[PDB]
Amino acid sequence: KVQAKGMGFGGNRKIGEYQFGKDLPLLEITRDSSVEMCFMENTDVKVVDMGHKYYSNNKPMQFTCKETPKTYYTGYSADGYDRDNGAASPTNDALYAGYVIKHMYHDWYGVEALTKSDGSPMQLVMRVHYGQGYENAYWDGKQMTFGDGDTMMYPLVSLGVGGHEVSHGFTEQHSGLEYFGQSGGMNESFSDMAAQAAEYYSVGKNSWQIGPEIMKEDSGYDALRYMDKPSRDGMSIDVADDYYGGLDVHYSSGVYNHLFYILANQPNWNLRMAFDVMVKANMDYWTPYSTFDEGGCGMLSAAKDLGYNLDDIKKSLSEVTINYQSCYV
Ligand SMILES: CC(C)C[C@H](C(=O)N[C@@H](C(=O)Nc1ccc(Cl)c(Cl)c1)C(C)C)P(=O)(O)O
Ligand SMILES: [Zn+2]
């Protein structure tokens, strides 16, 4: 097998169709020239076509690429497409999203996005077309799985959704924030922060929302979540003092989502600087049962290591009613 390039399409009916090879770079694929077969796979990312099944052998998506129709059109029909539920090619978008997320973590932090139990780098396995009408995505400890959506959502393959799911793995392999209570809200938030960071890495801008690009225009929802004012969704909370023990992690995530938005918008600050503090806290300070307040201490320690302004962080923490005075015993 050799290194090859893939030309084709991505996007969906809402955000529009674009072309790998014109609007965005070509995709990194592999080819077995002896059999004129190509694979949606490279060293860093493997795309699996689940075929709307709930299980798979996780072999890479494979498609015919003939010397006489190097660069080849993607898709089982060699036309650049892999259409499903209003998306041009969720498998192309998954291969690109994995590239972006892998290179964001390498370029910004010199770290693998994912690693095995023994520290060896872990290939990003992006499993697409999962299930029948599955309107979600999930991380399972070793790979990222994305449905094709149904009446409410387009296929859930985007930079943001991919960044969110890969970063559940980043958290599991670092702080290990447990997926309930306050630590679980932080876990969810870090993944929503990484969705923004992936967008910022790719195009230098981010929506401050989760999933607007995959919500159908007739669903009645503009987005899954809003980071500037989480309570816009009717359930998420904007400050730590509004937390209660029965609040799901997808709603208590509003605390650190709002905090991330606030910090990134302090004078002189940007998304990358805010994410630097969060990533370093996840890597070096946050503990599996962290409270919101303890997570603020970790942010402060991380910022001190990086040389970043602590008063700007303290002001942001106070705005989401996190008690950082506790950090100084
Ligand atoms: C970026 C996205 C795709 C990540 C996933 C996610 O947030 N999507 C769902 C959600 O809002 N769930 C949710 C909300 C409330 C409760 Cl009570 C529970 Cl149980 C789950 C769904 C609505 C698409 P993930 O965190 O599960 O991997
Ligand atoms: Zn999540």
Side-chain angles (χ1 to χ4, degrees), residues 173-235:
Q173 292 157 359
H174 288 89
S175 64
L177 286 163
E178 285 285 333
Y179 203 61
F180 48 71
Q182 295 171 65
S183 61
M186 299 177 57
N187 182 317
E188 262 312 292
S189 301
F190 182 81
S191 279
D192 287 336
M193 299 171 204
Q196 305 303 312
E199 291 182 6
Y200 204 72
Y201 180 94
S202 190
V203 294
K205 26 182 271 303
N206 64 283
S207 67
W208 290 120
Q209 299 178 357
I210 303 293
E213 64 273 18
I214 55 78
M215 288 316 300
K216 298 255 187 121
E217 303 100 304
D218 39 38
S219 67
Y221 298 97
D222 296 332
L224 297 175
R225 285 177 289 270
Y226 306 89
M227 293 179 90
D228 63 304
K229 185 180 165 156
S231 61
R232 183 175 295 104
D233 73 3
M235 195 64 64

Side-chain angles (χ1 to χ4, degrees), residues 164 168 179 188 250:
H164 182 107
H168 272 314
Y179 203 61
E188 262 312 292
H250 293 97

Side-chain angles (χ1 to χ4, degrees), residues 1 38 40 80 85 91 164 180 196 214 222 246 299 310 322:
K1 260 182 233 196
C38 277
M40 292 294 287
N85 192 35
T91 44
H164 182 107
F180 48 71
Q196 305 303 312
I214 55 78
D222 296 332
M299 281 182 66
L310 299 190
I322 282 165

Side-chain angles (χ1 to χ4, degrees), residues 30 35 101 124 135 141 151 167-168 220-221 259 274:
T30 37
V35 289
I101 297 151
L124 273 58
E135 303 201 290
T151 74
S167 298
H168 272 314
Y221 298 97
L259 171 62

Side-chain angles (χ1 to χ4, degrees), residues 8-211:
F9 302 96
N12 61 45
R13 291 201 227 291
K14 176 174 179 174
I15 73 187
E17 193 178 290
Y18 42 81
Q19 189 194 327
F20 298 101
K22 185 188 192 300
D23 298 304
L24 288 172
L26 287 168
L27 298 166
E28 325 283 2
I29 58 165
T30 37
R31 174 160 195 261
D32 184 351
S33 293
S34 91
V35 289
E36 299 187 318
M37 192 60 36
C38 277
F39 309 88
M40 292 294 287
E41 181 180 357
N42 52 72
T43 49
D44 294 353
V45 182
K46 167 163 65 174
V47 167
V48 172
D49 182 349
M50 303 291 289
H52 301 136
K53 302 303 204 170
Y54 294 87
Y55 67 85
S56 160
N57 56 34
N58 293 333
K59 286 176 202 308
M61 195 180 156
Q62 68 181 25
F63 61 104
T64 290
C65 53
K66 298 196 301 183
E67 171 171 59
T68 302
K70 226 62 163 273
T71 307
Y72 306 91
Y73 275 103
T74 62
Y76 295 137
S77 306
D79 56 6
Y81 288 103
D82 177 25
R83 297 189 181 82
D84 199 285
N85 192 35
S89 183
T91 44
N92 285 353
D93 278 334
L95 194 55
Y96 181 70
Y99 180 95
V100 167
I101 297 151
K102 172 77 184 75
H103 287 270
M104 186 271 296
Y105 274 108
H106 175 259
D107 282 12
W108 287 7
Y109 307 107
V111 310
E112 289 295 320
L114 298 172
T115 72
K116 306 197 193 75
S117 301
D118 59 357
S120 69
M122 194 169 98
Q123 186 183 49
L124 273 58
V125 175
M126 306 276 280
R127 312 204 296 161
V128 188
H129 309 289
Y130 171 87
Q132 315 183 227
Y134 186 73
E135 303 201 290
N136 223 328
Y138 70 92
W139 158 259
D140 75 345
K142 71 190 226 173
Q143 68 212 334
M144 286 78 51
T145 303
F146 308 89
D148 275 324
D150 189 3
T151 74
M152 299 282 264
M153 299 176 204
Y154 291 100
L156 290 90
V157 181
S158 62
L159 290 181
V161 172
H164 182 107
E165 295 302 346
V166 170
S167 298
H168 272 314
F170 184 92
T171 297
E172 178 176 298
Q173 292 157 359
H174 288 89
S175 64
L177 286 163
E178 285 285 333
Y179 203 61
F180 48 71
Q182 295 171 65
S183 61
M186 299 177 57
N187 182 317
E188 262 312 292
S189 301
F190 182 81
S191 279
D192 287 336
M193 299 171 204
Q196 305 303 312
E199 291 182 6
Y200 204 72
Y201 180 94
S202 190
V203 294
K205 26 182 271 303
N206 64 283
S207 67
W208 290 120
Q209 299 178 357
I210 303 293

